[PDB]
Amino acid sequence: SISISYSTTYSGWTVADYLADWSAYFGDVNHRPGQVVDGSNTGGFNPGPFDGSQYALKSTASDAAFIAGGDLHYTLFSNPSHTLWGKLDSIALGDTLTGGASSGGYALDSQEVSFSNLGLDSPIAQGRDGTVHKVVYGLMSGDSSALQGQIDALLKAVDPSLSINSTFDQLAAAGVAHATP
Numbered sequence: 553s554i555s556i557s558y559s560t561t562y563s564g565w566t567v568a569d570y571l572a573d574w575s576a577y578f579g580d581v582n583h584r585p586g587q588v589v590d591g592s593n594t595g596g597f598n599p600g601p602f603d604g605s606q607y608a609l610k611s612t613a614s615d616a617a618f619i620a621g622g623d624l625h626y627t628l629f630s631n632p633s634h635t636l637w638g639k640l641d642s643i644a645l646g647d648t649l650t651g652g653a654s655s656g657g658y659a660l661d662s663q664e665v666s667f668s669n670l671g672l673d674s675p676i677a678q679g680r681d682g683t684v685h686k687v688v689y690g691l692m693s694g695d696s697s698a699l700q701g702q703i704d705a706l707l708k709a710v711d712p713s714l715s716i717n718s719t720f721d722q723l724a725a726a727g728v729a730h731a732t733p
Contacts (some may be wrong), residue, residue, distance in 0.1 A: 553654070554614040554670070554703065554707060556658050556668075556720070556721040557666040557732075558664070558729055560731055560733060561664070562664060564720075568667055568700060568716040569717065570645075570720075571699065571700055573632075574665075574692075574696065575694055575728075577693070578613065578617075578618070578694060579612075580694040581593035595610075596653065598651075598652065604653070605623060606620065614647075615648075616645075616646075616647055617660060618644060618646070619646075620643055620693050621668070622640045622641040622670075623638045624637075624639070625676070630723070633677045635676060637676050637682050637685060639672070639673050640673075641668060641669060643666070643667050643670065644660055645660075647662040648660065650682070665720075667703055670702060670706070672684050672702065682704060683715065687699045688722055
């Protein structure tokens with residue numbers, strides 16, 4: 553079952569509300585052909601170099617950042633090119649990305665919301681159209697709609713009445729979410 557972890561600030565907020573606001577704050581790191589010319593909009597794997605239990609990225613617009621958790625791979629020059637695939641079990645949305653592979657992992661200084669047991673596994677075969685690639689590149693490029701659709705499917709799987717338009721305190725009442733600072 554999907555497990556959701558949220559800050560007391562966003563008690564009254566719906567999941568869609570928060571995800572839109574967060575996407576707006578993060579914006580778009582412009583990770584596209586010709587537009588990746590240093591390390592500022594690449595993000596990082598832990599441990600890396602091209603696979604890890606974490607892929608992390610901080611906004612080049614703001615202090616907003618996310619960490620993707622599971623067993624993630626990036627193919628680069630192996631068909632299909634520029635594919636991010638493997639197991640995604642969690643996403644953490646927060647400010648002030650700290651650490652990295654040198655530090656033994658990434659952590660959010662100020663985590664706002666987290667979704668865990670996503671149970672997404674996208675094979676290399678599916679290239680860019682695997683759910684894992686759509687979700688992560690969505691958060692990279694300022695569109696949280698893939699993540700939203702997945703969270704909505706999980707929420708409806710646990711209970712039909714639950715929705716992306718349920719508040720965090722409503723989902724907490726329904727046993728799904730647990731409140732944090």
